[PDB]
Structures are given as C-alpha cells and as structure tokens.
Design a protein around this nucleic acid. Structure first.
Lengths: 51, 99, 74, 100, 135
RNA sequence: AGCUUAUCACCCCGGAAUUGGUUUAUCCGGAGAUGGGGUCUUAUGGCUGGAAGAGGCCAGCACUGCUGGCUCCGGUGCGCUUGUGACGGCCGUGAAAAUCCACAGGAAGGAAUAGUUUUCAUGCCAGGUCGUACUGGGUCUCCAAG
C-alpha cells in the first residue's frame, strides 16, 4: 500500500504485479491516503483489509 | 489522645477494626486570579518536598503559579505596552522634528 | 505490603541470598473450586507477595527456589 | 519481558534515525528492526518457554540497500510466515524482499 | 485586508511556548483533514540566545549563541500576530505540512531551522526577533 | 502500597434572540449558551497485597493442647452522628509566625583510559530528654442502641 491510492500485490518469488486496486480517485489528495493494509491471518478466506 | 476537647483539629473518625470492635482513629492556588491550579496534586505543603517536579509543575511558563489564562492576558498586555511605547517614541520624534 | 505479578522479579528477590526465610500460603476459592496459593518474600523496604493460581506454576516456582533459602509453610 | 519487570529487559540504541518498526518472526527464533536511516538489522532471539533463564538476543547481520529519502527509510518490514525471509518497504517507491 | 503572510511574525500563547516569537511559514486558514480548524505552520525559538560580551572566551561565545528552535502547528487563537517580519523562503519548503506528524522528518527540519536562525542572529540582522520578550 | 474512579473547573469547534440551559433554593449565555469533541484536581468508593496464618461462631478427644468446618451473598431512609463539593445571602471585608512548597531571572559548570546534573528506583546508618500508674451542691470536656 502506498500514497498513490492504489494497492498492489506482488508475488513473493516472481515479483509480478499480479493484481491492483484503487481506493481513492484523488491520488494527489493530501487530506487522506492509504494508511495500512493487513491480510486476515485465518486461512481459506483470502481477505485483505485496507485502511 | 491526651486532648479530650472537640477542637476541629482533633476530630475523630469511626473505623471498624478487624477484631470486630469499633475503635477511634485520628484523621495550590493561582497567584493572580486565585483559582486552583490544574494538574497539581492537592497534598499537604510539607509533603511536596519529596514529590517529583513533574507532578508539582506543569510544562509551561508560570505553570506552577498560574492557570495559563492570566498568563495569556499578561503576555498580551506586555506586547501592547511595548507597541504603545514604540508609538510614544514615534510621537516624541515627531514632536522633536519641530523643536 | 506490596503485590507483584512479575515471576522473574520474585525469583531474583529470592536469588538475592540476603533473605533468611520465605513463606508460601495455600488458599481455597471458587469461581469450580481452585487451590489458590501465594508466594511471599521479605524485602528491605517492603514485603513482596506473588499471587499464583495454577498448581503447576506454584510447583515450578517452588522448584526454582534455591536450596539456600528456607521455606516455612503457611 | 512480561515476567521480568515493568522496565525493559534490555535497551538497544544503535540506529542513526527513528526506529520505524520491529517485527518478530512467526516461526523461527529471529526478529529484525526497521529505521528511517535505510538500514535493516536482524537479531537472533531465543525465548525459553518455561525455563527460568533470560532470553539470549544477539545481532546477526547489518542489511543495506534501502535509500534514505526525505529523512525517511524502511517504512515497514514483514517476515515470511515460514522462511527466514524479510520483506521491506521504503519511501523510495520501491518495496524489496530479502533472502539468505 | 488580510494580515497573515508567510513572513508575518506571531507569538505563541500556550503549549509551553507562551510569549515565544514565531514566524508563520505557511498560512493554512482553510485547514485540512487533520487540523480542520484555521491554523498556520510556524517556527520559533525555545531557548533564547544568551548575552555575549567581549570578556567571554571563544568557546563560551559559541555556547552562548546556541539556539534551540521548535516547529509545530498552532491555532490562531493562541497566536498573537505581530507587524514585524522575517525572511521565510530559506526554509518554507522544509517546514511544509508533510514534514510534521512523521519522524525523523522533523529532525532534519529542526536542524535546518537551527542553522538558519544561528546564521541570521549571529553577525546578522533581525535582532528584535532574536530577543526575549519579557512579559 | 499497586490499579480504576470527580462534582466543580479548564481548552477547542460551533454562534444563540423563533431567547435556550438549569438548582429544593434562579442565576447564567455574542464578555460566547444549547450542541459536539478533549484535559486534570482523585477527596470518596470498586479490586488486590497486609489477610486469614488474625479474631469470632461450632464440634472430638486429652484430661493438658491438639485436631477439623463457617467466617457468605443482598435490599434500604420522613430514623440519627460525621466528612466532603458547589451554592443563598449577612457586613465583621475579615489572627500571626515557624516550616514547607511554587515561579520572572539566565551568572555559574558540563568531554574523548569514567564531562556535568540525581526532584527516577533501589541498597546503608541514625533520630536525645520530659509524662505515660490510678481517682478525676462544691472546674471543664469526647460516643450516645432498640
């Protein structure tokens, strides 16, 4: 997660930017931005929390 | 104690002793506005000799004796006095420009 | 008297070697009764008491006590 | 240490800038610290489950490669769930992954 | 007419900086998601330089001239605007909004402000600003 | 001794009067209320240590103490004593000192085989003398159950 308003997922070994998602349309907005992201520890769900 | 009188300095409280019987047991203001200073423990004056300065003093100018309300007032008053003194000096210079 | 939940602090206090004796107090309580126990040592400034609920923890603490420290029961 | 005392068991102060984050290893007995100076350090740490012995923590290696930008360094770092690999993130708009 | 500018001088009223002169580096009357209220970025001096005399040695003179600055967002309510002004383009960018709220970005800005203030005070100008307002 | 805990009071946004808030008692608000968000004064209560090993209430034997249980969970004021917090006014603006604490202040001192500061925590030593028995219509005084 970065301040560009886009969350990117990279493979651990290949390193390819397999998937992306945009959270804030105003990437340059200084009022707020992506603060933190965390994967759900529980398996079989694949839930990514994006703050 | 040896004092049997009801003087307010010798008042007594009732405490239930663990033995089941009842026994007799002996029991910061602002310098400008007079209001109690916030953040300062209301302990006995003699007990402050061991408390850390952090509890006794707040992190502010005049913190240990002012509530920060009159501090602002006196700062503003000093600034206004300085500005008027500058203005008074300007007036003096203007007057001297003619004499 | 003072109460501390730091097991290693209590062990260090016992390990000081400058304490003549220690005492372990057995207690009973319920929430399903349990055998609550307490560990107490004598300090220079104040008495230190440790609260222990699990029997295994009490046994481990007793084992950890150096042999040079006497443990009077109750 | 949750059993030693309220104060830290040991105090470490070596980074040239603010320590942004330190993360324990989920499985292996290792942990690493992240700081704004762009340098990552990894420390081995043994944690006795029940033995009445203090933990043994020692430094292992100084990791370099991050670029300090705007007085900032490794914003975040996470260890692999099962391997001795450490992911890293920095202000240089380039995340990194570290491997033995 | 507005009287708040990047060069305007103000005095902090509260926050341990009561009666401390500060320079308004960047007015932010419109606010932001953080600090929505009307506010401006300011920089100031926490420890005023001590008096210097010829009798003092070279080592003592350097210590006396040492100044410890401070930078933080403060409300207009606790700011006392002053007619005087000082140069601000030297460090306006360094003390920008993104500098605050995240170390160690504050340390470099504080060091830059300290260097600028030391250069401007010692063998410089604006002695009035680098003076202790005795209130 | 360790956690938790404040009516009042203070700070920020907000700008009321189409007049709102509220005490038993009616005073307050453009000199900033209703409303929303934060601060601490911690008296006093809640939990733990001291502490059940104490006291008390029972039970058996010795025949001179030991050996075994309970010592729990609540409700309540037209009853009474006391403390605390903000109030209503009266008119006499309202004892001193010792001791302790608080701040404007920036002279003084601070470095490379141990630079300064010790209001943080622990460890160490010491604190004399005087009275302490009883009693207490003809001196004073502290508690007053149903």
């Amino acid at each position: 997660g970065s301040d560009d308003g886009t969350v990117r997922v990279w493979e651990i070994l290949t390193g390819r930017e397999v998937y992306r998602t945009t959270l804030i349309d105003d990437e340059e907005n200084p009022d707020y931005h992506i603060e933190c992201i965390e994967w759900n520890p529980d398996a079989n769900n694949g839930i990514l929390a994006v703050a | 104690r040896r004092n049997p009188y009801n003087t307010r300095s010798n008042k007594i409280k009732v405490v239930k002793t663990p033995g089941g019987i009842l026994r007799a047991q002996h029991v910061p203001k602002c310098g400008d506005c007079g209001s109690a200073l916030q953040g300062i423990s209301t302990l006995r004056p003699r007990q402050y000799a061991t408390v850390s300065k952090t509890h006794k003093t707040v992190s502010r100018a005049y913190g240990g004796s002012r509530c920060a309300n009159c501090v602002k007032e006196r700062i503003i008053r000093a600034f206004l006095i300085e500005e008027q003194k500058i203005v008074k000096k300007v007036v003096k210079e203007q007057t001297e420009a003619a004499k | 008297a003072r109460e501390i939940t730091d097991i290693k602090q209590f062990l260090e206090l016992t390990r000081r070697a400058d304490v003549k004796t220690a005492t372990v107090k057995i207690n009973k309580k319920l929430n399903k009764p349990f055998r609550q126990t307490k560990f107490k040592v004598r300090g220079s400034s104040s008495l230190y008491t440790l609260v222990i609920n699990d029997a295994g923890k009490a046994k481990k603490l007793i084992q950890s006590l150096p042999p040079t420290l006497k443990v009077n029961r109750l | 240490d949750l059993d030693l005392a309220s104060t830290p068991y040991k105090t470490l102060r070596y980074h040239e800038k603010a320590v942004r984050s330190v993360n324990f290893h989920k499985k292996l007995p290792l942990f690493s610290s992240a700081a704004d100076d762009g340098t990552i350090h990894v420390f081995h740490a043994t944690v006795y489950d029940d033995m009445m012995k203090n933990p043994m923590i020692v430094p292992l290696k100084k990791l370099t490669g991050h670029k300090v930008i705007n007085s900032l360094g490794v914003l975040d770092a996470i260890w692999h769930p099962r391997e001795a690999w450490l992911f890293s993130a920095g202000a240089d708009n380039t995340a990194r992954l570290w491997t033995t | 007419a507005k009287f708040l500018k990047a060069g305007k001088v103000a005095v902090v009223v509260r926050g341990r900086y009561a009666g401390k002169k500060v320079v308004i580096v960047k007015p932010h009357d419109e606010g932001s998601k953080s600090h929505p209220f009307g506010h401006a970025l300011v920089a100031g001096i926490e420890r005023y330089p001590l008096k210097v005399t010829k009798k003092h040695g070279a080592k003592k003179v350097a210590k006396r001239t040492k100044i410890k600055p401070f930078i933080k967002v403060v409300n207009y309510n606790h700011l006392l605007p002053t007619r005087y002004t000082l140069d601000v383009e030297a460090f306006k960018s360094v003390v920008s909004t993104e500098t605050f709220e995240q170390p160690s970005q504050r340390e470099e800005a504080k060091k830059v402000v300290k260097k600028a203030f030391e250069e401007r005070h010692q063998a410089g100008k604006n002695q009035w600003f680098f003076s202790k307002l005795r209130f």
